[PDB]
Amino acid sequence: FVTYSTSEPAKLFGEAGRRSHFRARVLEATLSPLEKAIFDVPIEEWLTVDRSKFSGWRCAVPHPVTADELKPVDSSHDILRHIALYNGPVTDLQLDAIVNAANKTCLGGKGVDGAIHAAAGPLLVRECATFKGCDTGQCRLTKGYNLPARYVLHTVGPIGERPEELRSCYRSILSLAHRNRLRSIGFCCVSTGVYGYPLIPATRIAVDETIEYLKQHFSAFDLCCFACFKLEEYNAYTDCLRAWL
Amino acid sequence: FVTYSTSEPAKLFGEAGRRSHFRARVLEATLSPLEKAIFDVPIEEWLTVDRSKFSGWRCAVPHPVTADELKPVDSSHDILRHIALYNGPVTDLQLDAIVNAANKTCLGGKGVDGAIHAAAGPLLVRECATFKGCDTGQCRLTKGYNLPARYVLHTVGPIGERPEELRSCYRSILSLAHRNRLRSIGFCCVSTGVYGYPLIPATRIAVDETIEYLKQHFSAFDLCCFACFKLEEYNAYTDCLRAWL
C-alpha cells in the first residue's frame, strides 16, 4: 500500500498558514444587507433587542428551551436553586449566554465548537475573526446570532488534565458573564471527551468553581445550566452535585 | 461590555502550540488491548479481514449502505454506470474508502471531518498523528476503524475558489485509491460550505475529474459515490451530471 499521494515532506511544517488564510477569507467576505444589519448591532444592545425584526435572523433551534423550563437541582437549597442540568445540546438553551469549548484561534473546530458555529451561522466566526484569539483559561464574548441564546462565551480549556487551567476557564466565564450582568448561562462540558480531561475530575472542577462563585456573589446569576449531551455527562454532574451535598 | 476576561495580548500569536500539544497527547496515550489489536492490523490487510472478530470494533452506523444499494446515475452509460449519488452522510457508506475533507494537520475539525472522526472513533486520529500531515491537493490513506467503510482518504482542499488545487485533490484521491486497488469510493463535498469554494464550480470540478479518471482508466473503479448530506448538494451533482451529459 502507498499511503500518501506524493513524496513525504522534509518534516512536519504545515498548519498555521491555513488558519491565518481562513481568518483572512472570513474577514474579506462581503456581507449582505440582512447580515450587515445584524452584525452591526452593538454587542451590549443584542441582549434585549427583538431579533425577529431582522429578516436575516432565523432561530436555528425549532423548539428552544427557556429558563422557566429548566428545573433546578434543588429548589429549596440557597445555592443549588440556581443550578440546573439539561440532558441535551447546549445550543437548545435560550439563556443570556452559552459556553463554547473553543481553541486558541476561536475560528471553530470539532465537537461542541462546530455545533455552536453551525447553529449560530456564519456571522459567529466573522465576529471571532475580528479579535486576537483566546488564551488558555480565558474567555471571549460574542453575539450568538442564530442561536436561541443571546451571547457566546468562548473559553479555551486545557488539552490534558491541568486542573488550574480548567479552574481558570470557569473563573473567567463566570466573572465575564457577571461583569456584563448576564444572569443565565448554559455550560457545555469543557475539555472532556477523547484524549481530553477525564470526565469526573473535570465535572468536579466545574461544579466546585460554579458553586464557589454563587456563594461569594449572591446577586450574580439566576441560573447556571450544565448542558449534558451524553447521558454519561449528565450522570457525572448528578454525582458531583450529590457528592458536593 | 467587557468582551475578554484579561488584558489583550501584544498581538495574535497562538494556535500551532495547541495542535502540536494535541498531537503529542494523542501519540502518548495508552491503548487498551482491544484497541491495540485493531490498531496493529497492517493497513493493506484491513480491506479484507472480518472486523466483527475484534471486540473493540463496533460499527458506528446501525444500518450501513452497501454498494448494491447505491443505484448509478445511468446504468446504460459506460462511464455513468460507475457513478451514484447518495442523499445522506458519507459515513453511512460501506465502501472500500470514503473521503474526508481534512485540514493540513489531519487531526480533525469542523464539518464532515469531525463527523468522520466521531464515527470512526479515537484510533482514526491516532493513525493521523503518526504521519506528517497532508499538503493542499494531496491525499493520505488510513484505516476507517469503526466506520462501515474500510479506509479513509484524507484530502486537503483549498480554502477559497482555487480550481487547480481542488482538481489536484480529486486527482490525488482517485490515483491513490487506484494504486491500492480500492474499487469503491464515497466522496464528500470537498472545500464547500461557509466561506469556502462555491457549490456549483466545486461540483463541476469533482464531476469532471472523476469522469476523466473513469474514461482514461477503464479498469480502476466499480463505483464512485457522491454523498450529499444536504439537498442543495445533491441537486448540484444532479445538475452537473446532467449538464455533463
Residue numbers in the entry:
A (entry chain A), B (entry chain A): 13 to 257
Give me lines lifted from the publication on this model:
We show that the trypanosomatid MacroD1/MacroD2 homologues are hydrolyzing both protein-linked ADP-ribose and free O-acetyl-ADP-ribose. Active site of the macrodomains is located at the C-terminal edge of the β-sheet and is lined by N-terminal ends of four α-helices.
Crystal structures of TbMDO were determined to 1.95 Å and 1.2 Å resolution (for crystal form 1 and 2, respectively) and crystal structure of TcMDO to 2.0 Å resolution. Structures of TbMDO and TcMDO comprise residues from 11–261 and 13–257, respectively and share a highly conserved structure (RMSD 0.84 Å). While the N-terminus of the TbMDO folds back to the core and extends the β-sheet, the N-terminus of the TcMDO packs to the precisely same site but in the neighboring molecule in the crystal. No complex of ADP-ribose with TcMDO could be acquired but comparing the TbMDO-ADP-ribose complex with TcMDO revealed that a loop aligning the distal ribose binding pocket adopts an open conformation, indicating that the ADP-ribose binding pocket at this region is not preformed in TcMDO. The observed open conformation is unlikely a crystal packing artefact, as there are no major constrictions caused by packing at this region of the crystal lattice. The larger enthalpy drop in TcMDO could be due to the open conformation of the active site. In the open conformation, the loop near the distal ribose is unable to interact with the phosphates of ADP and might explain the enthalpy change. Also TcMDO contains proline in this position indicating similar binding mode of the adenine moiety as observed in TbMDO.
